Amino acid sequence: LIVEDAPDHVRPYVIRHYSHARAVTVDTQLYRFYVTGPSSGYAFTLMGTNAPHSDALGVLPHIHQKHYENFYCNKGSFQLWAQSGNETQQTRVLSSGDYGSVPRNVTHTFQIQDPDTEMTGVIVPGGFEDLFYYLGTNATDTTHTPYIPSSTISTLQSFDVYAELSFTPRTDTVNGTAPANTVWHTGANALASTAGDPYFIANGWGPKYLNSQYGYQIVAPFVTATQAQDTNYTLSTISMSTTPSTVTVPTWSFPGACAFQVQEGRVVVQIGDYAATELGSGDVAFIPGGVEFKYYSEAYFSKVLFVSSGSDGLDQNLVNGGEEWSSVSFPADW
Amino acid sequence: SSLIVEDAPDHVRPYVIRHYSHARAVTVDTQLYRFYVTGPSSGYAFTLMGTNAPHSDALGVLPHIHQKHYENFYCNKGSFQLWAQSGNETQQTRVLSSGDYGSVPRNVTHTFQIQDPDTEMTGVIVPGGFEDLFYYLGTNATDTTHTPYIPSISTLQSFDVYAELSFTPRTDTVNGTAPANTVWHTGANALASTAGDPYFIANGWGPKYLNSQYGYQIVAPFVTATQAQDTNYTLSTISMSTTPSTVTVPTWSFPGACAFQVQEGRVVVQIGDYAATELGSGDVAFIPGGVEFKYYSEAYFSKVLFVSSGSDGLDQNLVNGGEEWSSVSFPADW
Ligand SMILES: *[C@@H]1O[C@H](CO)[C@@H](O[C@@H]2O[C@H](CO)[C@@H](O[C@@H]3O[C@H](CO[C@H]4O[C@H](CO)[C@@H](O)[C@H](O[C@H]5O[C@H](CO)[C@@H](O)[C@H](O)[C@@H]5O)[C@@H]4O)[C@@H](O)[C@H](O[C@H]4O[C@H](CO)[C@@H](O)[C@H](O)[C@@H]4O[C@H]4O[C@H](CO)[C@@H](O)[C@H](O)[C@@H]4O)[C@@H]3O)[C@H](O)[C@H]2NC(C)=O)[C@H](O)[C@H]1NC(C)=O
Ligand SMILES: *[C@@H]1O[C@H](CO)[C@@H](O[C@@H]2O[C@H](CO)[C@@H](O[C@@H]3O[C@H](CO[C@H]4O[C@H](CO)[C@@H](O)[C@H](O)[C@@H]4O)[C@@H](O)[C@H](O)[C@@H]3O)[C@H](O)[C@H]2NC(C)=O)[C@H](O)[C@H]1NC(C)=O
Ligand SMILES: *[C@@H]1O[C@H](CO)[C@@H](O)[C@H](O)[C@H]1NC(C)=O
Ligand SMILES: *[C@@H]1O[C@H](CO)[C@@H](O)[C@H](O)[C@H]1NC(C)=O
Ligand SMILES: *[C@@H]1O[C@H](CO)[C@@H](O)[C@H](O)[C@H]1NC(C)=O
Ligand SMILES: *[C@@H]1O[C@H](CO)[C@@H](O)[C@H](O)[C@H]1NC(C)=O
Ligand SMILES: *[C@@H]1O[C@H](CO)[C@@H](O)[C@H](O)[C@H]1NC(C)=O
Ligand SMILES: *[C@@H]1O[C@H](CO)[C@@H](O)[C@H](O)[C@H]1NC(C)=O
Ligand SMILES: *[C@@H]1O[C@H](CO)[C@@H](O)[C@H](O)[C@H]1NC(C)=O
Ligand SMILES: [Cu+2]
Ligand SMILES: [Cu+2]
């Protein structure tokens, strides 16, 4: 079940945090491809980027006309700038557990701030990694260190990267956000109600739902049908209690492929005809559409970043079967 | 007898206690405290505790000093602000996010305020036994489900808590710090030049050392003999690569007790005659002085918060045998 690089075809698998994962470097940045187009049947790409502080932008401002980009900060911190059409340009400094949503046709760029920064990208549809094989240089990285210590515009268009050379990232950031009057780590964040608009959710400040059918699970939606539209997927974090003795761990099966990366805790996953395996920080589990699976938290509290192809995968299912909830913690009693 | 315990033992012995175990939980208003290492369990060497709490618009504790205990604040997740002042020196304050550290020596006035919804503070207090104060002021908590937190003057001198009613937490915070002429997440941080002064180290910005004897390990000191003086302990984070197949995992036996809490990764500990046991996020291992033990990272990269009684524990040993290093990542080649 465990693999060192994402398979070159669809199958159940788990890839440990910092596994080789076809690693490439672009300057100081090291990219790992935990889920690829070939490994997901082109459903989505799930990549991890580790990098040190930089005084320069990490990528030139650009747009994707056919890909929805999602930025999740695993650790450290990076600034993200985003703008849809003539809407006011927005920017936030994401720290651990923060999220930034970048729908198609939204200009964006980012800059790495902290020394031990890790950015997990979820891009829909999959196959997006080809861009980095081109821009990057293969890295053997024998020791598995997070990152190594120390015409083109036309070409990029074929990778669905359209340069926005006139975009000037705003420079009036204060307390991790701009413009003024925005809410960042000081109040609730809502997902954009209008398709096409970027939005940001600070860790623990977005909408949540408690599902109590199989133990306590809290789903914090990041992307729903409203925002995905035809890109057809869902994204969220799922926090989990242990499974009480009175509950039978359920067996799931969905039409679309799905995957999750453990952020905190220890989660056991059983997929298809493979032995159960326990995942820790940054480990990724990939479940092909149509394959049965079971999971439970061995830790008293675990939190995972979850993505699903389709409108009704696991996270949406738990939300529908649960209730609105206003805490990152579940009830103290069963 | 078993290695893993749900509450710290009432005497010195090797043990592991999982994140969010009962650990003699108590609540003080919205804050839930867990005592992973106590005075009794460590022979009064030190206390290692965890506090989980939601956002609050008020201070989490009234300003105070401890005349006989050295307090240490480490942000596991979320964020909280910490204010500190020593004698005639300028009052300092920082907003700590994941991986950040704040040092509060004896006789330093301090207070804190919880900012994010899913905030966890790991406290290391030396010497051990101060936790009686939390038992005293707190209300016992059963917390059957092990949820992180429950959703929703003269007298204290005996517990070494001295009120400082004249202290007014400064309110000119900008970009997570005050006064303006400080460095926070924008440059290198040094440990205080002498004992008695508070200091703060942002994640990855403090001094680091690379030890290459047993695979690669990076030690980021937080407290050294210079700052500890007679409190006689060391504190740091230790980052670890896997152990090369050609390297024998070393065995250690120190004069004083030591412990660590995994922050990221998967670390296996083999203590005395107990079974090798793998720890995940927030899990704590405690090793009595004089007891042999081995540890190694199963994850490709793990980072733990480490504390040791004495001046020459594991972290100091790794520093003395290693070299100065300027990256949070280790070399790509053995
Ligand atoms: C809290 O934290 C936030 C960060 O989260 C801090 O925000 C930072 O604040 C500083 C200072 O305000 C910002 O830097 C300044 O940015 C100015 C605008 O830059 C853009 O426009 C210029 C003009 O066309 C371009 O050249 C720039 O391009 C370069 O930078 C971008 C990055 O944004 C790169 O992508 C490019 O490749 C380029 O490298 C930008 O597009 C900029 O004009 C200004 O530069 C002056 O000042 C610096 C030193 O501060 C000098 O080195 C430089 O020579 C300039 O000096 C002239 O102008 C100043 C101002 O009028 C005069 O005083 C001088 O005498 C001289 O005439 C500087 O770079 C920064 O962008 C911003 N960061 C973010 C993310 O928002 C907050 O300050 C902080 N708050 C507190 C209180 O601490
Ligand atoms: C960036 O984020 C900062 C937080 O990290 C923001 O700082 C906050 O700024 C507000 C507004 O200036 C402060 O609130 C005000 O505080 C003053 C002073 O409070 C103290 O003194 C009064 C009077 O003696 C006393 O009653 C209080 O108890 C305090 O002891 C009040 O007079 C105002 O009414 C108001 O409450 C916050 O205190 C301050 N927070 C911190 C932690 O510093 C900053 O404003 C943000 N900057 C921007 C541009 O958005
Ligand atoms: C994105 O922009 C292109 C160019 O205008 C347009 O043809 C396409 O329909 C847009 N796609 C979406 C999802 O808005
Ligand atoms: C680099 O790795 C990619 C796989 O991501 C592969 O397609 C290519 O052949 C490799 N190129 C070189 C020069 O090794
Ligand atoms: C959305 O994805 C699901 C699962 O991959 C698939 O069954 C469904 O046909 C898709 N919807 C559309 C309109 O393509
Ligand atoms: C702390 O302050 C008390 C009271 O002033 C003093 O007696 C004691 O020696 C001080 N301790 C340290 C370590 O500075
Ligand atoms: C601090 O200043 C006071 C006077 O306000 C003085 O009495 C005291 O000795 C000073 N502290 C030190 C350590 O010098
Ligand atoms: C505290 O302990 C008492 C005695 O065991 C128990 O009755 C009570 O329910 C406990 N309080 C809480 C909040 O758990
Ligand atoms: C410091 O701690 C070590 C380890 O517990 C102990 O052996 C030593 O005696 C202590 N030093 C002093 C001065 O007490
Ligand atoms: Cu992009
Ligand atoms: Cu204190």
Short mmCIF file of N, CA and C in Angstrom, two decimals, chain B residues 1-3 5 8-16 36-46 251-260 269-274 284-294 306-310 313-314:
data_model
loop_
_atom_site.label_atom_id
_atom_site.label_comp_id
_atom_site.label_asym_id
_atom_site.label_seq_id
_atom_site.Cartn_x
_atom_site.Cartn_y
_atom_site.Cartn_z
N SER B 1 1.89 -1.08 34.67
CA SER B 1 3.21 -1.60 34.18
C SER B 1 3.49 -1.17 32.74
N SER B 2 2.49 -1.34 31.87
CA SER B 2 2.56 -0.96 30.46
C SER B 2 3.20 0.43 30.26
N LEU B 3 3.87 0.63 29.14
CA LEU B 3 4.55 1.90 28.87
C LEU B 3 3.63 3.11 28.74
N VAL B 5 0.48 5.40 29.41
CA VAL B 5 -0.39 5.72 30.53
C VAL B 5 -1.38 6.81 30.15
N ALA B 8 -0.18 10.92 34.08
CA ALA B 8 1.22 10.77 34.48
C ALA B 8 1.32 9.95 35.77
N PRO B 9 2.34 9.07 35.89
CA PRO B 9 2.50 8.25 37.11
C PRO B 9 2.76 9.07 38.37
N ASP B 10 2.55 8.47 39.54
CA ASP B 10 2.77 9.17 40.80
C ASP B 10 4.20 8.99 41.33
N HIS B 11 5.06 8.43 40.48
CA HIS B 11 6.46 8.19 40.80
C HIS B 11 7.28 8.16 39.50
N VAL B 12 8.60 8.20 39.63
CA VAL B 12 9.48 8.20 38.46
C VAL B 12 9.60 6.85 37.76
N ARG B 13 9.27 6.82 36.47
CA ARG B 13 9.35 5.59 35.69
C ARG B 13 9.23 5.97 34.22
N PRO B 14 9.69 5.09 33.31
CA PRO B 14 9.57 5.41 31.88
C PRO B 14 8.09 5.36 31.50
N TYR B 15 7.65 6.26 30.63
CA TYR B 15 6.27 6.18 30.16
C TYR B 15 6.06 7.02 28.93
N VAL B 16 4.94 6.74 28.26
CA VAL B 16 4.53 7.50 27.10
C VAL B 16 3.09 7.87 27.39
N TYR B 36 1.13 16.35 31.21
CA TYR B 36 1.80 15.18 30.64
C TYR B 36 2.99 14.73 31.48
N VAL B 37 3.74 15.69 32.05
CA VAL B 37 4.85 15.39 32.96
C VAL B 37 4.61 16.27 34.18
N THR B 38 4.62 15.66 35.36
CA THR B 38 4.34 16.37 36.60
C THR B 38 5.54 16.32 37.53
N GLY B 39 5.43 17.00 38.67
CA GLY B 39 6.51 16.95 39.65
C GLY B 39 6.70 15.51 40.09
N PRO B 40 5.63 14.85 40.55
CA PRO B 40 5.75 13.45 40.99
C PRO B 40 6.30 12.51 39.90
N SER B 41 5.83 12.66 38.66
CA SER B 41 6.27 11.76 37.59
C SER B 41 7.71 11.98 37.15
N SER B 42 8.23 13.18 37.39
CA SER B 42 9.61 13.49 36.99
C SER B 42 10.58 13.65 38.17
N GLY B 43 10.14 13.34 39.39
CA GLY B 43 11.02 13.52 40.53
C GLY B 43 11.29 15.01 40.72
N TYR B 44 10.29 15.81 40.37
CA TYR B 44 10.31 17.27 40.45
C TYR B 44 11.31 17.98 39.55
N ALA B 45 11.78 17.29 38.51
CA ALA B 45 12.71 17.88 37.55
C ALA B 45 12.01 18.99 36.74
N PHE B 46 10.80 18.71 36.26
CA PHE B 46 10.08 19.68 35.45
C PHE B 46 8.63 19.27 35.23
N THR B 251 22.36 4.44 21.92
CA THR B 251 21.66 4.27 23.19
C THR B 251 22.17 5.40 24.07
N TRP B 252 21.26 5.97 24.85
CA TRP B 252 21.57 7.08 25.74
C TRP B 252 21.16 6.77 27.18
N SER B 253 21.94 7.28 28.12
CA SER B 253 21.60 7.15 29.54
C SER B 253 22.16 8.41 30.18
N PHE B 254 21.28 9.31 30.60
CA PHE B 254 21.70 10.59 31.17
C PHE B 254 21.56 10.70 32.67
N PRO B 255 22.31 11.62 33.29
CA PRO B 255 22.17 11.77 34.75
C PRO B 255 20.76 12.25 35.13
N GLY B 256 20.21 13.15 34.32
CA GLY B 256 18.89 13.67 34.63
C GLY B 256 17.77 13.23 33.73
N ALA B 257 16.56 13.39 34.23
CA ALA B 257 15.36 13.04 33.48
C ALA B 257 15.26 13.92 32.23
N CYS B 258 14.58 13.41 31.21
CA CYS B 258 14.35 14.20 30.02
C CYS B 258 13.03 13.75 29.42
N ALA B 259 12.51 14.54 28.51
CA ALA B 259 11.23 14.21 27.88
C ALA B 259 11.12 14.96 26.58
N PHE B 260 10.21 14.51 25.71
CA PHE B 260 9.98 15.28 24.50
C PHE B 260 8.54 15.08 24.06
N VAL B 269 10.42 5.43 20.19
CA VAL B 269 11.25 5.44 21.39
C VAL B 269 11.26 4.05 21.99
N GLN B 270 12.45 3.62 22.38
CA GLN B 270 12.60 2.32 23.02
C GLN B 270 13.29 2.61 24.34
N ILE B 271 12.51 2.55 25.42
CA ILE B 271 13.01 2.89 26.75
C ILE B 271 13.13 1.68 27.66
N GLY B 272 14.32 1.48 28.22
CA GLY B 272 14.53 0.36 29.12
C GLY B 272 14.15 -0.97 28.49
N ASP B 273 13.31 -1.73 29.18
CA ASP B 273 12.88 -3.02 28.66
C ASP B 273 11.49 -2.96 28.02
N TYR B 274 10.99 -1.75 27.77
CA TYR B 274 9.68 -1.61 27.14
C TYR B 274 9.77 -1.74 25.63
N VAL B 284 3.85 12.42 24.12
CA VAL B 284 4.99 12.71 25.00
C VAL B 284 5.69 11.46 25.54
N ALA B 285 7.02 11.47 25.52
CA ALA B 285 7.77 10.34 26.08
C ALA B 285 8.57 10.89 27.22
N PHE B 286 8.61 10.16 28.33
CA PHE B 286 9.38 10.61 29.50
C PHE B 286 10.38 9.53 29.87
N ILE B 287 11.64 9.93 30.07
CA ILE B 287 12.71 8.99 30.41
C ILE B 287 13.44 9.40 31.69
N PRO B 288 13.35 8.58 32.75
CA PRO B 288 14.03 8.90 34.00
C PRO B 288 15.55 8.97 33.79
N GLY B 289 16.20 9.78 34.60
CA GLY B 289 17.64 9.84 34.54
C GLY B 289 18.12 8.44 34.91
N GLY B 290 19.21 8.01 34.29
CA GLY B 290 19.74 6.69 34.60
C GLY B 290 19.08 5.55 33.86
N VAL B 291 18.06 5.82 33.05
CA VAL B 291 17.41 4.75 32.29
C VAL B 291 17.87 4.81 30.83
N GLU B 292 18.29 3.67 30.29
CA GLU B 292 18.78 3.61 28.90
C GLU B 292 17.64 3.75 27.91
N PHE B 293 17.89 4.46 26.81
CA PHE B 293 16.86 4.55 25.79
C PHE B 293 17.44 4.84 24.40
N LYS B 294 16.64 4.54 23.39
CA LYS B 294 16.97 4.79 22.00
C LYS B 294 15.78 5.45 21.36
N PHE B 306 11.99 19.33 23.15
CA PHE B 306 12.78 18.52 24.08
C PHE B 306 13.21 19.27 25.34
N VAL B 307 13.09 18.62 26.50
CA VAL B 307 13.51 19.24 27.76
C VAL B 307 14.35 18.22 28.53
N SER B 308 15.38 18.72 29.20
CA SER B 308 16.26 17.86 29.98
C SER B 308 16.69 18.50 31.28
N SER B 309 16.72 17.71 32.35
CA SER B 309 17.21 18.17 33.65
C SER B 309 18.72 17.98 33.60
N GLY B 310 19.47 19.01 33.98
CA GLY B 310 20.92 18.91 33.94
C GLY B 310 21.48 19.87 32.89
N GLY B 313 22.26 17.31 28.75
CA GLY B 313 21.32 16.34 28.21
C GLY B 313 21.51 16.13 26.72
N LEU B 314 20.58 15.40 26.12
CA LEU B 314 20.63 15.05 24.71
C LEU B 314 20.89 16.22 23.76
#
